[PDB]
Amino acid sequence: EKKVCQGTSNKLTQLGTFEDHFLSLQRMFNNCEVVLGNLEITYVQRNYDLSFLKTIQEVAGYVLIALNTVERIPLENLQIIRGNMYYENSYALAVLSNYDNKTGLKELPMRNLQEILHGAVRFSNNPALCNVESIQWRDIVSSDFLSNMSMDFQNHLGSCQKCDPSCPNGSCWGAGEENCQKLTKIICAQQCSGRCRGKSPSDCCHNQCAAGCTGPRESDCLVCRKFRDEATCKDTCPPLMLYNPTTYQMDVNPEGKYSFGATCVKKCPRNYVVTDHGSCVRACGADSYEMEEDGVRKCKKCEGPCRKVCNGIGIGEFKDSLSINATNIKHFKNCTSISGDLHILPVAFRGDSFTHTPPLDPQELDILKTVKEITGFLLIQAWPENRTDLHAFENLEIIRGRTKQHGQFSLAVVSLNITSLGLRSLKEISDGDVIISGNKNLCYANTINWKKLFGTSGQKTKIISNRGENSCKATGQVCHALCSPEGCWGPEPRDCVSHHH
Amino acid sequence: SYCINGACAFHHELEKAICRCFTGYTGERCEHLTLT
Numbered sequence: 001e002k003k004v005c006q007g008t009s010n011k012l013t014q015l016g017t018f019e020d021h022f023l024s025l026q027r028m029f030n031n032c033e034v035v036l037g038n039l040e041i042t043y044v045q046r047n048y049d050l051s052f053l054k055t056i057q058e059v060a061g062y063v064l065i066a067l068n069t070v071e072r073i074p075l076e077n078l079q080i081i082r083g084n085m086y087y088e089n090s091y092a093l094a095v096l097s098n099y100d101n102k103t104g105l106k107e108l109p110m111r112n113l114q115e116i117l118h119g120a121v122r123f124s125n126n127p128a129l130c131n132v133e134s135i136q137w138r139d140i141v142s143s144d145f146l147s148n149m150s151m152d153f154q155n156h157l158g159s160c161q162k163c164d165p166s167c168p169n170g171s172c173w174g175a176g177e178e179n180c181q182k183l184t185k186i187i188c189a190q191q192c193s194g195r196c197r198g199k200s201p202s203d204c205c206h207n208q209c210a211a212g213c214t215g216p217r218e219s220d221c222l223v224c225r226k227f228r229d230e231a232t233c234k235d236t237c238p239p240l241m242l243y244n245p246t247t248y249q250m251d252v253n254p255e256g257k258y259s260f261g262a263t264c265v266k267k268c269p270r271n272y273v274v275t276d277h278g279s280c281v282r283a284c285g286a287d288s289y290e291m292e293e294d295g296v297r298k299c300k301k302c303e304g305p306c307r308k309v310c311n312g313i314g315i316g317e318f319k320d321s322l323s324i325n326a327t328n329i330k331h332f333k334n335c336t337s338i339s340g341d342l343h344i345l346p347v348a349f350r351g352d353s354f355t356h357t358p359p360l361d362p363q364e365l366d367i368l369k370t371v372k373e374i375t376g377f378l379l380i381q382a383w384p385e386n387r388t389d390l391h392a393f394e395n396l397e398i399i400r401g402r403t404k405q406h407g408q409f410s411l412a413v414v415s416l417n418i419t420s421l422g423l424r425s426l427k428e429i430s431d432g433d434v435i436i437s438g439n440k441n442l443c444y445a446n447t448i449n450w451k452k453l454f455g456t457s458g459q460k461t462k463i464i465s466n467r468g469e470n471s472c473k474a475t476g477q478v479c480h481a482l483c484s485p486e487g488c489w490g491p492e493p494r495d496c497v498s499h500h501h
Numbered sequence: 502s503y504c505i506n507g508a509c510a511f512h513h514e515l516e517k518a519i520c521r522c523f524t525g526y527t528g529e530r531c532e533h534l535t536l537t
C-alpha cells in the first residue's frame with residue numbers, strides 16, 4: 001500500500017504567518033503519496049522549497065493551488081485527481097491567482113497528470129505561468145465537464161521557454177522532453193473503451209484503468225478508476241456478503257474487504273470505522289455511532305447509550321458557521337454524540353453583526369449537558385467569566401479527535417476565566433494533542449495524569465501560563481485529600497480522576 | 502465588521518474579502534485565537 005495523508009479543507013484561509021502556513025503544509029503532505037482529501041497549496045512564498053510534493057501520486061478531492069509566489073511547485077508525479085469534492089461547486093483543479101509584479105508560479109511540471117475523474121479546471125490570472133497554456137485538456141478532463149472549463153492565460157512576464165519538438169502538438173507541461181504531455185485518451189482507437197498506450201487497437205487499456213496503463217490486463221493500470229485490490233483494479237471491493245442461491249440466503253464472505261478511500265482493505269485502519277455499506281469512514285456521523293463489535297469498530301444505529309447524533313460546527317446545518325450561537329445552541333438540544341468538531345469563540349458572546357447573530361445567553365450553554373461523545377475536537381476559546389468551570393461538559397465522556405484543530409489539538413482550553421476544568425466524566429482522549437493555556441485562574445490542570453486518558457502513543461500536552469502551582473497551593477485550591485495521584489478536575493471528591501464519586 | 506480581528510482587503514479577481522489577522526488571531530474572519 002501507499003503512504004497516505006488526509007489533506008486539508010481550508011480553501012483560501014491562511015494560518016498564522018507565512019512560515020507557520022508552510023510548516024503546516026510541509027508537516028501535512030510530508031511523504032504523502034495518496035491524499036485522501038484535498039490538496040491545498042496556498043501562500044507559498046519566495047524561495048520556499050516544495051520538493052516534498054514530488055511524492056504525491058493521486059488526490060481524491062480537489063487541488064487548489066493559489067495565492068503562492070514560489071517560482072516552482074513540483075507536482076511531478078500527481079497522476080490522477082479523482083475530484084470527489086469540488087472547489088466552489090465546479091472545479092477539481094483550481095490554479096487561481098499566484099502572482100506577487102510578474103514573478104511566481106512559473107513552473108508547474110505536472111508531467112504525469114492525465115486523469116480528472118470528476119469536475120472541471122480553472123486557471124485564472126497567473127502572469128508567470130509558462131507551459132500550461134499549451135496543454136490539451138480534452139485528454140485529461142472528462143467530456144461531461146468540458147463545458148465548465150474556465151481557462152485563462154494572459155502572460156505578462158513573457159519569459160517562458162518553448163516546448164520540446166518531440167511533444168505532440170507542442171503540448172508540454174514544461175521545457176524538456178520529460179515534460180511532454182502524454183496523451184492517453186484522445187489518441188486511442190474506436191475499439192478502446194477507455195485509455196490506451198498507443199494509436200493501435202492492441203494498445204487499449206483495461207476498463208478499470210485510469211490515466212493510462214502499461215499492459216492490457218487489469219493489473220497493469222497506472223491508477224485504478226474505482227477500487228484497487230492488492231495489485232488488481234476492480235469495479236468494487238469483494239463484498240462482505242454473498243448471495244447463496246441454494247439456501248436463498250446472504251452468507252458471510254471470507255474474502256470480503258472494506259473500502260478505504262480507493263483501496264480494498266481486509267480491516268479498516270486506526271482512527272477509521274466500518275459502516276453498514278462496507279466503507280471505512282473517519283467517524284460515524286449520520287444516525288450512527290462507534291461500537292466495538294466482533295472486536296472491530298462498526299457504525300451502529302443510535303440506540304441505547306446513544307440518544308441523538310448531531311453535527312458539529314463546520315458541517316451539516318452548522319456548516320459555514322463559526323461557533324455556537326444564540327441560534328445554534330437550540331439545535332444542540334439533547335444530543336449525546338457530536339459528529340465532528342466543537343467551536344466556542346468570543347464572537348459567540350459578543351455577537352456578530354455580519355451574521356445577524358445576537359449575543360449568546362450563557363445559561364443556554366447548559367444545553368450541552370447531554371453531550372457525552374465528540375468525534376472531532378473540543379475548542380473553547382471563550383467562556384462566561386461569571387462561570388468558574390466547564391459545567392456544560394459535566395457529563396462529556398470521550399473525545400475521539402478523528403478531526404483535529406489544525407491537524408494537532410483534540411482539546412483546546414484557551415484564555416478562559418475558569419478556576420477548574422470540571423470535566424468529571426471525561427475518561428478518554430483517543431487521538432490528538434491537548435493544549436491548555438492562558439487560563440490565568442485555572443489551577444488543577446497540571447495534576448491530571450493525561451497518559452491515562454490518551455489512547456494513541458505520542459499525544460502531547462501544552463498546559464502553560466495558567467495559574468501557578470504554588471499560587472494554588474498557598475490558597476488550598478489543590479486536589480482533594482480523597483483524590484489519587486492521577487489528579488483532579490476540581491477541588492471536590494467528585495472531581496478526582498481516581499477514588500472518585 | 503467582516504474581519505473581527507484583522508484588516509479587510511478585497512481581491513477583485515477572486516471577488517473575495519480576505520482578512521489579514523492581527524498579532525494573536527487567525528481564521529477566515531480572524532475569529533480564532535492562534536494556538537501555539
Ligand SMILES: *[C@@H]1O[C@H](CO)[C@@H](O[C@@H]2O[C@H](CO)[C@@H](O[C@@H]3O[C@H](CO)[C@@H](O)[C@H](O)[C@@H]3O)[C@H](O)[C@H]2NC(C)=O)[C@H](O)[C@H]1NC(C)=O
Nearest residue numbers: 317318319320321322323324325326327328347352355357
Ligand atoms: C451563528 O449561527 C448561525 C446559525 O447557524 C450562523 O448563520 C449562518 O451563517 C452563514 C454565513 O454565510 C450562512 O451560510 C450561507 O451560505 C451560503 C453560501 O455562502 C449563502 O448563499 C447564504 O445566504 C448563507 O450566507 C448560513 O445559512 C447561516 N445559517 C442560518 C442563518 O441558520 C451564523 O453564521 C453564526 N454566527 C457566526 C458569527 O458564525
Ligand SMILES: *[C@@H]1O[C@H](CO)[C@@H](O[C@@H]2O[C@H](CO)[C@@H](O[C@@H]3O[C@H](CO)[C@@H](O)[C@H](O)[C@@H]3O)[C@H](O)[C@H]2NC(C)=O)[C@H](O)[C@H]1NC(C)=O
Nearest residue numbers: 383384385386387388389416417418419420440441442475
Ligand atoms: C473571572 O474569574 C475570577 C475568579 O473566579 C472572578 O473573581 C471572583 O469573583 C467572585 C465574585 O463573583 C469573588 O467571590 C467573592 O469573594 C469575596 C472575598 O474576596 C467574598 O466576600 C464574596 O462574598 C464573593 O464570594 C472571588 O473572590 C473572585 N476571585 C478572586 C478575587 O480571585 C471574576 O469575577 C471573573 N470575571 C468576571 C468579569 O466576573
Ligand SMILES: *[C@@H]1O[C@H](CO)[C@@H](O[C@@H]2O[C@H](CO)[C@@H](O)[C@H](O)[C@H]2NC(C)=O)[C@H](O)[C@H]1NC(C)=O
Nearest residue numbers: 022023024025026027028029030031032052055
Ligand atoms: C519530514 O520528513 C523528513 C524525513 O522524511 C524529516 O527529516 C528529518 O528531520 C529530523 C529533524 O531534525 C532529522 O533529525 C532527521 O535526520 C531528518 N531526516 C530523516 C531521514 O529522518 C522532516 O523533519 C519532516 N518534517 C516535518 C515538518 O514533519
